[PDB]
């Protein structure tokens, strides 16, 4: 089981971490969504699958910078949502194929009521997922963290 990026940036075996930057749209109004969909960004497979099963969980998700200041953010892991940062880690998805699967991973995050200007600034650490990765075959028990970054500023109008 590893994970690699749209880009090519791969977490090996075992877990380890690696960077994410992701465009995000450059105006969000209150009452919408800015949506972060690493489904298109994150993907993972099985190495074994003829003899193994993964289980894959969004161990813990953390906002960081104008993300957790100007943001009320929901996570939806696998079509279910849940708070965002946080709260528990996620129900298990499986991942029995050889062929890469987006790990699917998507932030809605709306702005607070003090939001209002540059809410979160380009290049900036917008959040870190630990992806959690077991087995039906042994104790492996690993770790791929995400960090994710702006590419862009957001603008909250006021
Ligand atoms: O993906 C199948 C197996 O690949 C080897 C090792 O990463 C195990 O943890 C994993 O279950």
Redesign the pocket.
């Known amino acids: 089981?590893?994970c690699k990026t749209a880009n090519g940036t791969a977490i090996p075996?075992?877990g380890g971490s690696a960077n994410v930057y992701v465009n995000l749209a450059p105006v969000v109004n209150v009452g919408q969504n800015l949506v972060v969909d690493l489904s298109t960004q994150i993907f993972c497979?099985?190495?074994?699958?003829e003899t193994?099963t993964?289980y894959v969980t969004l161990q813990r998700g953390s906002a960081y910078g104008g993300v957790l200041s100007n943001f009320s953010g929901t996570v939806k892991y696998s079509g279910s949502s849940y708070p965002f940062p946080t709260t528990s880690e996620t129900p298990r998805v499986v991942?029995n194929s050889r062929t890469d699967k987006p790990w699917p991973v998507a932030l809605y995050l709306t702005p607070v009521s003090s939001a209002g200007g540059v809410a979160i600034k380009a290049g900036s650490l917008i959040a870190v997922l630990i992806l959690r990765?077991?087995?039906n075959?042994?104790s492996?028990d690993?770790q791929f963290v995400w960090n994710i970054y702006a590419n862009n500023d957001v603008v909250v109008p006021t």
Request: aromatic letters at 26%; a negative charge.
């Open positions: 089981f590893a075996i075992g497979h099985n190495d074994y699958p193994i993964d991942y990765q077991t087995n075959y042994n492996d690993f």
